[PDB]
Amino acid sequence: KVFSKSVPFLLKPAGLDGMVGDVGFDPLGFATFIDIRWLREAELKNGRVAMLAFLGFIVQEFIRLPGDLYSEPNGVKAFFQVGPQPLLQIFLFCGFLEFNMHKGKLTQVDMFEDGKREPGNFGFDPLGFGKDPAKRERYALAELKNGRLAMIAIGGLVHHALVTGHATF
Amino acid sequence: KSTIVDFNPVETSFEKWAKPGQFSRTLAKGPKTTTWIWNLHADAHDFDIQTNSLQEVSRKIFSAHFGQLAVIFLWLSGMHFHGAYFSNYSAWLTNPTSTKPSAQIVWPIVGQEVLNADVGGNFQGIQITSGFFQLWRAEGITSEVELYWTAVGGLVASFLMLFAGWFHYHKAAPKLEWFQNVESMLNHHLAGLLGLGSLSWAGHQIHIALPINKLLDLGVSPEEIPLPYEFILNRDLIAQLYPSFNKGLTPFFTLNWGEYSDFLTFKGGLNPVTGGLWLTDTAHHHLAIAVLFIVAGHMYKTNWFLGHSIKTILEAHKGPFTGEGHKGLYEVLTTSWHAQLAINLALFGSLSIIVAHHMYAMPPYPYIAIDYPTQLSLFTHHVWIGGFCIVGGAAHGAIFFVRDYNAANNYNNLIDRVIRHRDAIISHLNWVCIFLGCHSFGLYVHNDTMRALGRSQDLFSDNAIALKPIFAQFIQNLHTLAPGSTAPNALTTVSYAFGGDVISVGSKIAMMPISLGTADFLVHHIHAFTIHVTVLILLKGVLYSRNSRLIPDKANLGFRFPCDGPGRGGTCQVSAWDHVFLGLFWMYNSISIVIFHFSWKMQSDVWGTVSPTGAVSHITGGNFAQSSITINGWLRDFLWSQAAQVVQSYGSSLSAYGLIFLGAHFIWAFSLMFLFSGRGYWQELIESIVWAHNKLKVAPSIQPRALSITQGRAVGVAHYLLGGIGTTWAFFLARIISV
Amino acid sequence: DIGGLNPCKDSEVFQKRLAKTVKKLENRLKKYEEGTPPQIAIQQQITQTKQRFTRYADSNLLCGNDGLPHLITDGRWSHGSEFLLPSILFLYISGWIGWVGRKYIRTVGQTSNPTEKEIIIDVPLAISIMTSGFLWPFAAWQEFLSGDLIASDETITTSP
Amino acid sequence: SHTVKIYDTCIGCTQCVRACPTDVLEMVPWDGCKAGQIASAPRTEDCVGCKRCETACPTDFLSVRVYLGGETTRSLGLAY
Amino acid sequence: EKSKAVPFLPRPAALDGSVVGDVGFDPVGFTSWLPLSYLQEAEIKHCRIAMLATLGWIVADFVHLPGAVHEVSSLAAHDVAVKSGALAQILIWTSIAEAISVIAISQMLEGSGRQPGDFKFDPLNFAKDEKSLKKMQLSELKNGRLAMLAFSGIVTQAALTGHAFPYM
Amino acid sequence: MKDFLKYLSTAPVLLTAWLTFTAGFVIEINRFYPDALTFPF
């Protein structure tokens, strides 16, 4: 028996072999009954959204926009003060982005049905970082780790605002 | 390698849990139509068709009994836990006559918190009609901590019974010879179970319930009453209430049992403080029952040259009119589980009905006679359980006749001779049923039409043509004269229902002489007629379960089959199951009439309030005597009149009873769709629905089929019973809680 | 206004109903003692009743002559939160349910044992299909266009 | 008496004949199927209409069909 | 035959010699109908939990964390900590650890090779070869049993008599 | 835990779990936002 590298008292999970964040961490075996490509796509998207949202917290409490609506240093209270109209526009824009970036196939059964789709690979690289394949793997691992850390931190900041109410500081 | 058990017969594995229908040879292949799903649950406990060995069936039955007892223990633990945590039992103890027992609080969601009634004692919740508070008080339970510990013990016992079932199916399963030791089983169930349970309960009553309840009746608050264990360690806390414990057990071993007359009395009647039976009388009763049952347990020969053989007893009881007599009955009852189930279920339902009668007749718990909802609910529930169990006993007798009956082994015995003249039995029972129905009901209809025609002197009433139940009144007179004449050591009659004084607790009547007039004559004959018709249906099912003049090979079609075909003019419902279906309907009718008679008679001529000068005013006002003799009277002065509380319960804490009233009406009417219709129409409608699904590519792989004819009948009867019983349940509960 | 109804904010019978309910609840509250849980529960009932009546008053709700909110479901967007928006919400949810059920039926209908996978659900595949129902309006008007939504003549018919 | 008809979809599996409770059906030689036999109904006067015959028929929509008709003490199953 | 612990009782027939802390003590034959690895894991879990619990009870009756909520005796600390939510955090993280334990014990029972109670947690070494590991396993088992009995006595005495650290 | 998880995948257990979850979130929505006669928006 091999046993996992992360959880040393557990057997090595299956389906994670050719990935860019494999430390053998899957005690519940989510990769066995869920497609690993979909799981990586979801992890990357959740991580990127969490990173953007954490940066949004830190900037919102600091900078903010001119106007009476955009005057709440607290993100949770800003979600309510801003009203539904600005939020629904963000929702529709995110939907438009989702549609055009995945080119129609948006669901768990439709995406990766034909393969030829690296999980999380939207081809988005205008600044050109990533031409060298040597640093590409390191950049992918850094993105994954930062995304996970940002998921934890996004939960932390949101719940700090809920239990205190003032801000993050 | 024990001689009674087999070790590790079945492996404890989850593999068969993932293969539904593995028990059945036909269902194991997997579902092809939706009929497979229904067949899966209809054959789950039919262990006879799952194995060909009586040993395996017996082991499955034994483990199923353990599972059932674990379920019962879990239910009891839940009841005690609710009494401990979500009840006003402590408040009810200090004010039994003014606080309504409640042991279930309702969460505040969707406005349902209105169900939390003003039960009293600074409590909000649902009023409890199961009488647990009175039972706990009779047990001497004076604190909610004791209820919590009883709940914990119930949980432990439930786990123990689950473990016992698992152990005796998978680790050590008893052999067939162990199960067939009916002599040993009877000896143990009679001495150990019954007698030693009575003895242990008598000990508990004498040492815990007798002193604690005596202190409670004396006015001592539950907080200053000593803890129950102190009544055992200290022979002076109990010797003050009953000054006979000072002599210890010496009077018992010296045969001077007269010294124990302090706490082993024979009084009769009711406790004037609580309205229940004297707990000293109860303890003496349980002691006598224990001795009698222990003695009765030393009857059958088990392992020594001592006792009886049931085979030799039965085989010696022949006669000129009965041929071989009881020869072969021992083989029938030791090789067929269905025959044992028939006998046990019939006698068990009859026992439940007898229990229901003796409950209200002689209230055995403190402050339970003045809790009218508890009395009504207990009687109705126990009578319903008795009727259901009796129908089940008839059903399993029919099942035994179809499946486990061997013609060769029963040559010219009682079973054979009964089948040989089944025609005579059924024809005479038919004549008796027609006679009884004609008379009882047509006397009711004659009263109704005489009243409708303005001829009040032509009725079958007390102020008219009178049918006095003289035989029952003679018995009532004999019982009220028994103390001092035939029961010379009695101080009071067994029940005040036979006659005597009005017993009231807190201005509320506990018991009172139940007068019998022409109204009781008619309703008693209605009871006899309904019981006779139910017996007719069930006995026709049992006797004609194997063959008939219509179908000479009905036994080859099994116990459960819809018909033999449209031929012979139509052979619907010829099974024996279709007789347990009709008998279920008629049992519902009979029990409904019985509980209606009880409710109206008690409310009109027993229950009520007593004025300080001794004037008795009842709940309804004595309208039973003159208005229960016509069907219009039953419709108006009982159904319409006492349904006022149910229909006016909206917005109050009894609104749940009105909602259940309406829902039970809905379910009862829903049943008639299955009872009146047939399978072909529903199959052909499912055909068009399946066409639509196929048109939308959503037709299931498991082909949807209409419920089988037998399952359609079963669904119809189940819904009919549920709707009717629920309607009566809501009506009774709302009416008797409001007033 | 519409159909002769009037706003509940100006309906006297509505306020009479509120006052009567509050009075009944307070009378019930009078028979308990101090800050005991029954009094807390009755006070919560009173607070919830007042909040519900206030919300119904300030909700563009039309009340009849009985002082009860009447629903205007003719289709006008003015009273669109009474029927139209809940109608859209239910249509979305029910279309989701039907779409995931149909997709699961058609997916396990092409396996070796289609009937086995209906009593014993393939939970991985079931979860995969169920979370994909958020696009059911788009999936339905992408399968109907391709002719994959409707059968044509392989469907069975009775004798006549 | 009821009417019983046999149709050439008969596969000669004999399940109808051995299910008749009144000896109405019998197997007769034939050349329209592999078994070389077809059911016959030469004693329909004893037909009771129980339709056990067509409950045992494996062919798609039956090869033995029972049409209920005039009633008789034999067809009504009257022991009296 | 003739188990070491109870010399007049037969050997439990499931504990021959190949388990740490195996003196053949199973009079009521718990090992005759339950997996040995399962019972070993349960015993080791109890040992560790009760060792931590005894140390915490004794220490918290001496040293208190800053704050008014932490100014109660260990006997009354349960009702205070549950109200403050202190025990909720322990419950959450213990539940996470116990779900991972569900996975681990399932894998151990269905093959794998993980010894009962072996989570491979060993930042320091403290056990370099087989002999040291066996000796330290025996020490852990004995200390855990002693601490289970000690916590039992501590709780029973403290509940009987509401005394401070000397629970006599 | 290979056949136990298959047992939990049966129709009755899955339907019971799904209906329990469904009733749960419905009841909790009605607890946190009670007496909702119209759409909140």
Ligand code: CLA
């Ligand atoms: C004095 C001895 C004794 C006692 C008390 C019982 C008691 C019981 N037997 Mg039993 N039985 C006995 C001897 C005894 N039996 C013998 C010698 C045989 C062999 C012929 C059987 C064969 C037998 C069968 C085949 C069945 C029973 C069943 C039952 C139960 C009937 C259900 C009931 O009334 O609920 C009353 C319930 C209670 C009062 C709850 C408390 C009872 C607990 C469990 C004590 C049980 C005593 C037990 C025999 C002690 C053995 C302990 C074990 C470690 C050896 C009841 C618990 C039936 C049953 O329900 O199966 C489980 C059943 O199907 N018995």
Ligand code: CLA
């Ligand atoms: C000690 C009691 C007892 C026992 C052990 C049995 C045991 C048995 N009976 Mg039996 N029976 C009993 C009492 C009993 N019965 C009673 C009291 C009646 C009269 C109604 C019957 C009537 C009866 C018939 C008519 C038949 C049996 C059959 C059987 C056998 C198969 C049972 C099965 O698979 O059902 C599995 C269990 C179910 C299908 C459960 C069905 C659910 C019920 C009907 C509804 C319950 C609703 C419940 C009250 C909650 C409603 C509340 C609502 C708000 C939701 C089995 C040997 C059958 C057989 O073939 O025997 C060989 C058969 O045909 N019995």
Ligand code: CLA
């Ligand atoms: C109100 C409806 C109703 C009525 C009146 C009856 C009546 C009867 N049922 Mg029942 N039954 C009912 C509903 C009813 N049933 C339902 C819903 C079911 C479904 C489960 C059944 C299922 C059922 C079964 C399975 C059986 C019966 C049987 C009986 C008969 C018992 C013998 C008897 O009393 O005959 C006497 C007749 C009456 C009491 C009816 C009223 C007669 C009046 C009062 C006296 C005579 C009037 C006079 C002749 C009128 C002449 C004037 C006229 C010509 C103008 C009786 C005919 C049993 C049977 O066959 O009989 C033994 C039987 O086995 N029934």
Ligand code: CLA
């Ligand atoms: C079974 C384990 C256990 C449990 C349930 C508790 C529970 C409690 N302790 Mg406690 N404690 C423990 C072990 C335990 N302790 C140990 C081993 C020590 C010695 C360091 C202490 C020292 C201690 C002090 C000094 C105080 C408490 C206090 C308290 C109470 C509230 C605050 C709190 O949770 O402690 C906070 C706990 C600490 C600050 C130290 C805990 C150190 C841990 C147990 C050692 C490392 C283990 C590791 C983290 C395990 C990982 C778990 C895994 C699932 C990830 C609460 C009743 C406080 C109180 O109210 O007293 C009445 C208080 O003042 N404890």
Ligand SMILES: CC(/C=C/C=C(C)/C=C/[C@@]12O[C@]1(C)C[C@@H](O)CC2(C)C)=C\C=C\C=C(C)\C=C\C=C(C)\C=C\[C@@]12O[C@]1(C)C[C@@H](O)CC2(C)C
């Ligand atoms: C921090 C955390 C996890 C941190 C892990 C980190 C950062 C490391 C992550 C990574 O290394 C991995 C793993 C793998 C790498 O490939 C990726 C990176 C990213 C490198 C979880 C916090 C988890 C935090 C949790 C669970 C907090 C729960 C708090 C609760 C429940 C509070 C409740 C109360 O506040 C209320 C509600 C009311 C009050 O009155 C009472 C109380 C009780 C106090």
Ligand SMILES: CC(/C=C/C=C(C)/C=C/[C@@]12O[C@]1(C)C[C@@H](O)CC2(C)C)=C\C=C\C=C(C)\C=C\C=C(C)\C=C\[C@@]12O[C@]1(C)C[C@@H](O)CC2(C)C
């Ligand atoms: C609990 C949690 C993470 C827990 C992580 C744990 C335990 C990790 C443990 C580990 O790492 C360690 C410790 C060590 C590792 O080696 C092993 C593991 C085991 C992996 C994240 C919560 C994460 C929680 C998140 C992200 C919640 C975000 C909430 C948002 C955005 C809410 C928005 C709103 O609330 C507003 C603002 C207004 C409302 O009215 C409307 C809405 C819209 C609802």
Ligand SMILES: CC1=C(C/C=C(\C)CCC[C@H](C)CCC[C@H](C)CCCC(C)C)C(=O)c2ccccc2C1=O
């Ligand atoms: C409607 C009907 C059907 C069709 C009924 C069917 C197909 C039953 C469908 C049951 C569904 C599929 C499952 C049950 C759904 C309920 C909502 C669950 C019960 C409610 C719980 C609270 C118990 C018959 O097959 C039939 C057969 C013979 C005589 C009469 C009838 C008859 O009336």
Ligand code: SF4
């Ligand atoms: S279907 Fe109904 S009617 Fe036709 S035979 Fe069977 S039972 Fe008699």
